[PDB]
Amino acid sequence: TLIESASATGDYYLTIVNTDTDYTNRDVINATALMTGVSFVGKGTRKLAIGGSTSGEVSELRISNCGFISTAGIEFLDNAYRILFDKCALSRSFTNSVIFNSPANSGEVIKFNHCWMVDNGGPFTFKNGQFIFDSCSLPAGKKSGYFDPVVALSDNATTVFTNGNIEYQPGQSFVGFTVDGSSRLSISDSTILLPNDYSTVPIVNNGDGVVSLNNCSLPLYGSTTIATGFATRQLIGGLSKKIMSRGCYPRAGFITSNWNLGCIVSPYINSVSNGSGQFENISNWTLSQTGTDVVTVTTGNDVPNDLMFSTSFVLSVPTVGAAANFTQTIIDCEPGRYFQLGFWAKNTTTTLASIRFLDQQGNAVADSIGYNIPVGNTFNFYALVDCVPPGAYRAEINFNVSSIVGGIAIHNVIYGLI
Amino acid sequence: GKKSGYFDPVVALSDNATTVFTNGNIEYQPGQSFVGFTVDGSSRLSISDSTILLPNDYSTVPIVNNGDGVVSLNNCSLPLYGSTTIATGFATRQLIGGLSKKIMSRGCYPRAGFITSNWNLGCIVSPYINSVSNGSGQFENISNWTLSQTGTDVVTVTTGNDVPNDLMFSTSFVLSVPTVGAAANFTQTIIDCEPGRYFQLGFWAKNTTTTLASIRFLDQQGNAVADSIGYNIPVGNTFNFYALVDCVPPGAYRAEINFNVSSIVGGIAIHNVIYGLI
Ligand code: NA
Ligand SMILES: [Zn+2]
Incomplete structure (x- = not known):
């Protein structure tokens, strides 16, 4: 364990270089390059530098079973690539964790293998470069x-x-x-x-x-x-x-x-189309009346946020006798794979949202999955993640409104495979 | 090395x-x-x-x-x-x-x-990686393609042996523009779209007319879900390969490959049209 003293000055506590600038010797030297078995405990002011504009190529270096704890980060300079951090700790860093500010002749296959990188206080800046995390854990906090x-x-x-x-x-x-x-x-x-x-x-x-x-x-x-x-x-x-x-x-x-x-x-990840009324019509949707009075549908500007769409569907139930199904089907099904289904809703009627899966002939291949949307005057997001059943050809998203005079605003309907 | x-x-x-x-x-x-x-x-x-x-x-x-x-x-x-x-x-x-x-x-x-x-x-x-069918006229017909006139006179399409090479197909489509007033769209749609995933689009072309190639993505009701991506094919007397790699947009159900020919008396040979997800 190497503990940096309080009086230590400079920006770097360790710089890794290669004074051999010859091509013939590079592979011979870098094949055996090794630093192992050392825990560095800094005080948050000094960094570790790899490479340099005047250095030979620092590559194929194995840094194994080492700790870089409470330092000011690891900085890559020129001519540093294919570094192997083989089971190392990079934790409790101050200001920066890893600095890769696109240095020249650097960045090829930099690999962190089984590294513990937690409780850091600075970013991993990857401006260009190629980085591999394998069986690492991060960030904890x-x-x-x-x-x-x-x-x-x-x-x-x-x-x-x-x-x-x-x-x-x-x-x-x-x-x-x-x-x-x-x-x-x-x-x-x-x-x-x-x-x-x-x-x-x-x-x-x-x-x-x-x-x-x-x-x-x-x-x-x-x-x-x-x-x-x-x-x-x-x-x-x-x-x-x-x-x-x-x-x-x-x-x-x-x-x-x-x-x-x-x-x-x-x-x-959405194969629904016009899922938020952005077309200013109900194309890709059908509204099938099932009661005595008519449920109406329109596209309005009542949204939870406009980060993606400024429109929503609004289904209106004018009487207790009005009832209808608001439906879109999506031909995007892979049996055995999980799907995502999501939408915003603000409901003041009785709305049963459901999804079922149909084959190419329109037969349901499994029981539908339904959800009664809670009543209220605020937008809330709802989502279902489940597995596509065998025989599924198209997914069917349905909203059934009925019973209670009121309506429901539906925003950003989403379905896709994950 | x-x-x-x-x-x-x-x-x-x-x-x-x-x-x-x-x-x-x-x-x-x-x-x-x-x-x-x-x-x-x-x-x-x-x-x-x-x-x-x-x-x-x-x-x-x-x-x-x-x-x-x-x-x-x-x-x-x-x-x-x-x-x-x-x-x-x-x-x-x-x-x-x-x-x-x-x-x-x-x-x-x-x-x-x-x-x-x-x-x-x-x-x-x-x-x-190609879900296009008859993308090079190998059927000796224009199955899976539609020619729609948009100008005066008639643009014609045939299948012939004018190819850049014979490594995959020995045929190509040839669209011919007989007059400056003639214009037409030559279109195939492919039901093979996964939003968020990249697609590949490619073809050989040798163009002496004015040809705007484009791809756009339609939903199950035929609505375009995003702006089309167009490319004016350069004029010349040699075959060249063209390709576009981009991301499938949300809502996409079918990709629409279209060639619009117009304006200049001449033609274009189109060979080995390719579309698929990568
Ligand atoms: Na289909
Ligand atoms: Zn692996």
Whole structure:
């Protein structure tokens, strides 16, 4: 354990260089390059530097069984790439955690293997570069009074997060990943664990950014505060529509009668069309009367927020005898795969929302799943995450209004596979 | 790169070998160009969460899939924009060569985006990721296509042998504009859309009229769910490959590939139209 003294000055406590600038010797030297078995305990003022404009290429360096605790971060300089952090701790950092400010001749396959990265007080700045997280855990929480330890991708950076855990402790709530410019984030075979009071989103996708989720355990049931102030109760924020998810599932299941506790992956995984009345008509929907009087439908400007749409459908029940079905079907079904269904609603009549799955001949292939929307004068988000049944060809979203004189505003209807 | 004067350092799978390439980088230095992976027999290659980086004058393909081989790409950064020399002499400007049609790709994307007005700089993953049918006139008719007149006189369409190469099809569509007043749309729609996932669109064209090619996405009721992406095909007397790689928009149910010809007496030969998800 190397504890930095209080009198230590400068910006760096350790700089890793290669005074051999010769090509012939590079592979010979870098094959055996090793730093192992040291815990560095800083005082939050000095960084670790890798490379340098005057250094030879620092690559294929194994940093194994090492700790970088309470430092001012790890900074990549010129000529630093393919560094292997092999089971290391990078925790309790001050001001910065990892600095990659697009240095020259740097960034190829930088891998964190089984790394413990928690309680940091500064961002992971990935301006370009290629970063791999494998069986890592982060962020747990942030250093109180400092900056969010966000993994911030910008320019043309890529980041893989696989076989790991994205978890926040109770009382911790901040964005963990941001994707900007033409950056890309891929998360696979991992768990994302959010405490009950988590009120933002773990991932924000901006610009030309891409986010892809693959066989991940997701917190899609239980919370009514996730993504407070976003377009929907969604796991991925931002306005970039380049969102992909396959094989993801609710962590420990989903109580299908409590759509009020549901969360979707993203509002852009949506094969519904005109799901918020943005066409200023009801194209892709049919309204089938079932009572004595006529239920009416219109498109209005009463919305919970205008982050995606400024319109909503409004179904009106003028008499106790009026009743109707408001229906759209979506040809987008893969049996055995989970789907997401979501919508905002403000209901003052009796509305039964349901989904069922039909085959190519229109036969229902399984029992429908219904949910009575609570009555009230506020918008609330509802979502269902469940598995597509065998034989399904098209999903059918239906709203049945009846019984009570009033109406329901329906905003941003969403259905897609995750 | 390769050792100068020696053999290609190709990763050559034969018989019943398997190979996984994950979390890594497949990159060639400037001035280096050779096939990096070959798949033969009943071998299988899977590439995941990796980058494939090709220099400016790279002129072949990094992967060749032969026989009963399988190649699968998963969430990879691909060089799909910028080069007109990739896969020189192959059936299309494609990243995977060979004749094996067992090609899969999900979650792949152009490395740093795609300037959607420059289809002349586009590259596709594979011509076998194709849900277009009769995309090259191989049926000797225009099944799955519609010709709709929009001007005076009549634009005509035939299938003929005018091709850039015979590696996949020996036929092409030929649209002919007889007068300056003639105009028509030549359209196929493909029900194969996953919102949020990238698509590939590609075709060979040799154009002496005014041809606006475009793709747009329609819902199940035929409404466009986003602005169409159009590309004016350059005029000339040579075949060139054009491609667009972009993201399927929300609400998309069917992709609509359209060629609008008008204005100039002449024609356009269209060869090996390709659309699929990657
Ligand atoms: Na269909
Ligand atoms: Zn893996």
